[PDB]
From a paper:
Within the family of genes that encode peptidoglycan production the gene product of ftsI, named PBP3 in E. coli, is an essential monofunctional, Class B PBP transpeptidase. PBP3 catalyses the cross-linking of peptide stems from adjacent glycan strands in peptidoglycan to create the strong, mesh-like structure of the final polymer. The β-lactam class of antibiotics, which includes penicillins, cephalosporins, monobactams and carbapenems, exhibit efficacy against both Gram-negative and Gram-positive bacteria and are well tolerated, efficacious and broadly prescribed. Their mechanism of action is through covalently modifying the active site serine in the transpeptidase site of PBPs, leading to the inhibition of cell well biosynthesis and cell death. Bicycle molecules are bicyclic peptides formed through the structural constraint of peptides around a trimeric scaffold via the formation of thioether cysteine linkages.
The Bicycle molecule binds in the active site cleft, in a region previously demonstrated as the binding site for β-lactams such as piperacillin and AIC499, a newer monobactam. The buried surface area of the peptide bound to the protein is approximately double that of the buried surface area of the protein reacted with piperacillin (1832 Å2 and 951 Å2 respectively). Compared to apo structures of EcPBP3, the backbone conformation of the bound EcPBP3 is largely unchanged despite the presence of the large ligand (RMSD of 0.357 Å). The peptide adopts a rough “Figure-of-8” conformation within the active site, with the N- and C-terminus of the peptide linked via two arms of the scaffold and completing the “8”. The peptide is 5.3 Å away and only interacts with the conserved active site catalytic residues (i.e. Ser307, Lys 310, Ser359, Asn361, Lys494 and Thr495) via bridging waters. Loop 1 of the peptide extends beyond the binding footprint of β-lactams within the transpeptidase catalytic site of EcPBP3, with Phe2 binding a previously unengaged pocket of EcPBP3 created by Glu304, Met422 and Val501 of the protein. Trp6 of the peptide interacts with a hydrophobic wall comprising Tyr541, Tyr511 and Lys499 of EcPBP3, in a similar fashion to the interactions of the gem-dimethyl group of aztreonam with Tyr503, Tyr532 and Phe533 of P. aeruginosa PBP331. Val7 participates in intramolecular interactions with the TATA scaffold and C-terminal cysteine, making a significant contribution to the positioning of the C-terminal half of the peptide. The electron density for the peptide residues and the scaffold moiety is largely complete, with the exception of the lysine sidechain and N-terminal residues.
Residue numbers in the entry:
A (entry chain AAA): 233 to 280, 295 to 568
B (entry chain A): 1 to 14
């Protein structure tokens, strides 16, 4: 007895197919998860013979919330901390943001997706800290739904860490995830730190999970993430009238089997909604967009908003904005 | 140039 809700599957496929066409993209995937049960409510590939739900990509900015949660847990920062976000060098490598800010709050670090801010959190913690947190939220763990190429992503078992490697890991690079893995991360965010397996078969709630992160810290960062879908945030194009949403939008470049990059982009948005009491985790990935826009916020955020808004209406979720 | 995993391409930071 499958967990997929065919209403949600049909609107996910419709919106994903339209976004793949609009962006003149090779393909796209979307995965929708119930943050209380781990049930997969929708899971779509576009086109339907391009089996991209299990393709791996560097998760980029979608890991930044986990970096803020870890820094708060370790007491590197407090809830109202302000970071110095002036660009600087790590081992000769210039660390910069899209836009230069001299300083950001922790909310600003997510709103502006500050590489400078998250690098300073990372280099204030042992290299083991983010390795442990990412693992707690399921990165490097198999998903077990029975799909071709499924497996466990590309996750470091690293003995030795340069400063720049510690920083790029906090940015979400030098590791790879599947859409299913990332959806499970965001389901663990939506539950406020309860890790549950994905299911393509129905379960009866409540589903006991593994406590992998304190509720207070995860909820703190979910509220900070709301800024990303407000003006001046990287994910404003994902905003849904009537709802608070907690998202991150990001971009990777495609890696060949030689570990060399080619000039094909992977645009993604991951999120939970409604942010007041999450119901759903959603991941949308657009592969090789070719209509002159390449980044997550431009390419994948609009379809995140179209799909999540359609889900919230279909499932009669009460609007939680204002 | 960039390479995976030792010198990744990073959004917003050349
Ligand atoms: C802010 C940019 C950044 O951290 N990186 C990009 N970069 C490049 O060399 C471009 C591919 C420096 N980085 C390294 O990991 C050093 C090889 C990552």
């Amino acid at each position: 007895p499958l967990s997929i809700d065919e209403r949600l599957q049909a609107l996910v496929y419709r919106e994903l197919n339209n976004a793949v066409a609009f962006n003149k993209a090779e393909s796209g995937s979307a995965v929708l998860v119930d943050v209380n049960t781990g049930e997969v409510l929708a899971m779509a590939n576009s086109p339907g013979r391009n089996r991209t739900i299990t393709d791996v990509f560097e998760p980029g900015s979608t890991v930044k919330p986990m970096v803020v949660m870890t820094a708060l847990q370790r007491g590197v920062v407090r809830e109202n901390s302000v970071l110095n976000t002036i660009p600087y060098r790590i081992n000769g490598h210039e660390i910069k943001d899209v836009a230069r800010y001299s300083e950001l709050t922790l909310t600003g670090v997510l709103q502006k997706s500050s590489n400078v801010g998250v690098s300073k959190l990372a280099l204030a913690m042992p290299s083991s800290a983010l390795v442990d947190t990412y693992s707690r939220f399921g990165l490097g763990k198999a998903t077990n739904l029975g799909l071709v190429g499924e497996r466990s992503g590309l996750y470091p078992q690293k003995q030795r860490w340069s400063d720049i490697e510690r920083a790029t890991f906090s940015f979400g690079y030098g590791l790879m995830v599947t859409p299913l893995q990332l959806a499970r991360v965001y389901a663990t965010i939506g539950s406020y730190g309860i890790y549950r397996p994905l299911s393509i078969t129905k379960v009866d709630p409540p589903v006991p999970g593994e406590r992998v992160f304190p509720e207070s810290i995860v909820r703190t960062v979910v509220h900070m993430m709301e800024s990303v879908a407000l003006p001046g945030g990287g994910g404003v194009k994902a905003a849904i009238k009537g709802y608070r949403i907690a998202i991150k939008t990001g971009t990777a470049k495609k890696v060949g089997p030689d570990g060399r990059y080619i000039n094909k982009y992977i645009a993604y948005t991951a999120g939970v909604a409604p942010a007041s009491q999450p119901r759903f985790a959603l991941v949308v990935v657009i592969n090789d967009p070719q209509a002159g826009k390449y980044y997550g916020g431009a390419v994948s955020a609009p379809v995140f908003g179209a799909i999540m808004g359609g889900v919230l209406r279909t499932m009669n979720i009460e609007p939680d904005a204002l | 140039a960039c390479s995976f995993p030792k010198c990744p391409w990073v959004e917003g930071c050349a």
